[PDB]
Amino acid sequence: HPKYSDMIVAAIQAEKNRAGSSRQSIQKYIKSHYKVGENADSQIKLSIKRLVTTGVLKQTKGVGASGSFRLAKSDE
DNA sequence: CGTACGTGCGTTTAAGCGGTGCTAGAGCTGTCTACGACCAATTGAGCGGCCTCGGCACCGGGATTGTGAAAAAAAAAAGCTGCA
Ligand SMILES: [Ca+2]
Ligand SMILES: [Ca+2]
Ligand SMILES: [Ca+2]
Ligand SMILES: [Ca+2]
Ligand SMILES: [Ca+2]
Ligand SMILES: [Ca+2]
């Protein structure tokens, strides 16, 4: 298997559609070829929690925990 | 009382001196990655409390033995001796 910032790239990159990108449609695609452990959902929200704050991923619209994201940082 | 160990002497030996040459290896740098801290999540091994019952303390008594101490027997010591 590959890492979870390896997995988060594959869903949003391949197709590009529902709610810009959001939490359910990412986890549906991700499970098909990561091969699911129980920790999948726990370390997929953690991967998002540190990727949104670093600059690799930037968020479109939300409040606190919920929302929707993109890949290209804002103004870049 | 006997001699082992200090003292002082001459003979012998090699430590110490410095110098020189040759180099193992101490020690430093740069490159990459396996590995350990450090997250959040799952969870069962070990914690505190508490209950039972057999190990062990305790007694006791009476037999045994190990451990002396006294008194009694042997040997040796000291004083006499007399003798070839
Ligand atoms: Ca579970
Ligand atoms: Ca206990
Ligand atoms: Ca209890
Ligand atoms: Ca018991
Ligand atoms: Ca018993
Ligand atoms: Ca007794």
User: SS3 sequence, A19-41?
Assistant: CECCHHHHHHHHHHHHCCCCCHH
Cα(A14) to centroid(ligand 1), Å: 30
How many domains does chain A contain in total?
Answer: 1
3-state percent helix, strand, coil for chain A, nearest multiple of 5: 50, 10, 40
Resolution in A: 3.4
**Structure obtained using:** X-ray
Domain boundaries, position A9: 1-76
CB A75 under 7 Å to nucleic chain B? no
Judge whether A20 and A60 are in contact, CB under 8 Å. yes
What nucleotide is nearest A39 when CA is compared to C1'?
B41
Entry field: residues in chain A: 76
Q: How far apart are CA A35 and CA A75, in angstroms?
A: 35
